[PDB]
Amino acid sequence: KLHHLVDDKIHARSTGPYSMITQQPLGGKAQFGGQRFGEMECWAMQAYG
Amino acid sequence: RMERVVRERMTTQDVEAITPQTLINIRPVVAAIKEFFGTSQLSQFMDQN
Amino acid sequence: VNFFDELRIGLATAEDIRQWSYGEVKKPETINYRTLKP
Amino acid sequence: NLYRELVDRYGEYFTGAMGAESIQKLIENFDIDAEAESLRDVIRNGKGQKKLRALKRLKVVAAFQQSGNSPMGMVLDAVPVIPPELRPMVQLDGGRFATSDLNDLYRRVINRNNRLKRLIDLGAPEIIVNNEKRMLQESVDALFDNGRRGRPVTGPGNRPLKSLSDLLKGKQGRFRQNLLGKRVDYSGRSVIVVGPQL
Amino acid sequence: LRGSRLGAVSYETDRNHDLAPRQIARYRTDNGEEFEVPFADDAEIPGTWLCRNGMEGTLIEGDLPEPKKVKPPRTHWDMLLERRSIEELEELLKERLELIRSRRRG
Amino acid sequence: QTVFMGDFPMMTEKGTFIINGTERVVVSQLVRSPGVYFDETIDKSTDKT
Amino acid sequence: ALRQARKDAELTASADSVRAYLKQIGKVALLNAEEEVELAKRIEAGLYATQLMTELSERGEKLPAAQRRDMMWICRDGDRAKNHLLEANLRLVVSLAKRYTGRGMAFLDLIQEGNLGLIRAVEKFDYTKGYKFSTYATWWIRQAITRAMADQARTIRIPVHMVEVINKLGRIQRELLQDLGREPTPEELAKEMDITPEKVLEIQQYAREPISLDQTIGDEGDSQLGDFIEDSEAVVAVDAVSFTLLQDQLQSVLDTLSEREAGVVRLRFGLTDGQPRTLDEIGQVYGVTRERIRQIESKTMSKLRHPSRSQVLRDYL
């Protein structure tokens, strides 16, 4: 039984803490934290229109 | 580092009044050991799964 | 307000720089050590 | 030695200086138009390496001629200071403090500028004043872009400091990401399994 | 790892429909710069003001109270004066004067 | 004299050090030994060793 | 040949700029006591001469041409001799400042504060006491260097007296670590310090210097630390909407109350003006007394404790 259990991985955020200098959401699941909607996803959403 | 300190203070200190207790500075040696065992990429956190 | 249409970068001059500012910082201190106020 | 013996014997007939103020005087006494036309003449008639050097220069000379930018802005007289909240001083849990690493560079610049002001007001030799001006130049250079001239201005632990350029530049600088990709609210993640009845 | 700017955000709602009335004063520096400051109505107007430029400016209104600025703290001349005497310095000045005399015309 | 040089961390029976209550392991490092190392390249502009 | 190589090396870039400053100061050699006496007499004579022209300029003299010209010469030569003395002892400034590096400040900053102390020392040098200049000047150099180190080497500026007590506490705890071996406990440090333990604790708190927001994530510098600090001073986005809903509900419950007495409560707690004002002001705006106001306050207050008004308001507290 490997040490990659779901309870360590499941994560969600509607609203939570915010970063310091920039006002972006925090991340890492230690706080609430959010997922990085990075550059490649920006391209993927641009391609959809 | 300690040798640099000790040979700096060999000259400035008066002769016929000194002893290795007064000459040896152990703070840089213990600082180096503590800096090695803590915050070094090779002094790794022990992985016990 | 939006209505963004152009962005013009350019070499700023001293008369522009001292027109942007609201003051002239002239002391190398940040916070009073005891009361923690700027 | 040569310079001092010309100036103390031939003090008239010319003006000669040293440092950034001399560059400012040069930019003051510089006709962009006639120089640009001379470069056009060189490209029109000359050839070879002189040609290529004329092409590269004109790419900068004609850039300053076409728009309304005076080239005086190349030298600097008043240095702007970024707002405090973009270089914050925060009190971490534990009564600690965290600078944003620009406060130290600004402190160095203000220290050296104030020291230069006091030196000039008091009456100081040419060597000390020129050394102070050179350090003011180096502090401003470190503020705008670390790692360019000399050595990177280091901090504790021999870590290079983060200047203003090192915040625009880099993969982690604002221009590339934290502007194109951002952490988002109303989001989550989880490990996935097969849903063959969906 | 919490953090704070040593400030507090007030959850108050804007009340632009009425504010306390605000007067406006015009300050002027020595080099012909003009600055407008919306000072409080029920408040004193300081004729000497530190303006947006950074130098000290005075009000365009004519008051001129002249705060009697302080003399220079200490000069080289003050420091030589306290460690010597006037006649000793006059003797040294005479010594240098006759020195350059004997240098020049012999 | 007999000068106190400082506390020296001691490895336990299991091959691990104990720093600040936590357990840490110093990982053996592979490095390039000092010496003389004669090596060759080829030059495509000249075809010589 | 060899001298040609010397002249070639004389013109190099030296991008370090401390090496450049050192090659610059290498131009000027040292001086001995008699020329120090000569320079001191020259600078004092020039300063007296400039004082005397300034005195004679005001309301004074149409000076003789030769006398006028030659104490102009004296006045310029005083500054010349001064300048020469400072150039002579800049290397002394460097020699005293070389040992204070490695902490707090940079090297050339310390050089420049030593130079300022040197100007101050040549300002207060007396030669009639018959002493070598270095003995007197070292005092001012060390004072200026330690002052500029004290009040210009921390992001949060600690004044000089607290810097001195912090340095003394650090030295004492260091020597006790080296000699006693056993780590100094704070109260014993207070005993040696001849101060109270709580003052020692406050000193230990004040000495703490700020880390950077651009260092290690937790252990290594993968991500700047400033990307893992929350913001307690921020809109949490549930407080704002909850606060607005509280506003509307409190206004509704106040409206369901009686007429003008709910409004007296509104003024008393300042729900529209922003300031509370007192019974004098409520009476002034209404034309009534103060005891009636307090009775109205108590009567209105009693009803809002009753559940129908409280049930839609209790959850907010």
Most extensive interface between two protein chains, with residue counts = D-G, 37 and 38 residues
Tell me the total number of β-strands of chain G. Answer: 1
SSE run of chain G: HHHHHHHHHEHHHHH
Q: What would you call the quaternary organization?
A: part of a larger assembly
Class of secondary structure makeup of chain G: mainly alpha
Helix/strand/pairing class of chain E, anyone? alpha+beta
Using the CA coordinates, give the radius of gyration of chain G: 37 Å
N to C succession of SSEs of chain E: EEEEHH
CA distance, first residue to last residue of chain G: 92 Å
Biggest beta-sheet profile of chain E: 4 strands, antiparallel
PDB class: transcription/dna
Keywords: Promoter escape, transcription, transcription-DNA complex
Entry title: Off-pathway Mycobacterium tuberculosis transcription initiation promoter complex (RNA Polymerase with Sigma-A, CarD, and RbpA)
Chains A, B, F: DNA-directed RNA polymerase subunit beta
What does this structure look like?
This is part of a larger assembly, with three copies of chain A (49 residues), two copies of chain C, one copy of chain E (106 residues) and one copy of chain G (317 residues). Chain A is α+β, with helices and mostly antiparallel strands and 49 residues long. Helix content of chain A is 20%, strand content 10%. Chain A has one helix and two strands; from the N terminus they run ββα. Chain E is an alpha+beta fold. Helices cover 25% and strands 14% of the residues of chain E. The longest helix of chain E has 19 residues, at 86-104. In chain G, helix 4 crosses helix 6 and helix 8 (186-193) crosses helix 9 (197-207). Chain G is elongated and about 105 Å long. Chain G has helices spanning 2-10, 18-25, 33-57, 65-97, 107-123, 133-151, 160-179, 186-193, 197-207, 239-255, 261-268, 279-286, 291-304, 307-311, and one strand spanning 211-212. Chain D binds chain E through residues 85, 88-93, 98, and chain E through 1-6. Strand 1 (43-45) of chain B pairs antiparallel with strand 2 of chain F. Chain C: DNA-dependent RNA polymerase catalyzes the transcription of DNA into RNA using the four ribonucleoside triphosphates as substrates. Chain C: The RNAP catalytic core consists of 2 alpha, 1 beta, 1 beta' and 1 omega subunit. When a sigma factor is associated with the core the holoenzyme is formed, which can initiate transcription. Chain C: It comes from Mycobacterium bovis (strain ATCC BAA-935 / AF2122/97).
Give me some keywords for this one.
part of a larger assembly; 7 chains; E: 106 residues; alpha+beta; 4-stranded antiparallel sheet; 4 strands; G: 317 residues; mainly alpha; 14 helices; elongated
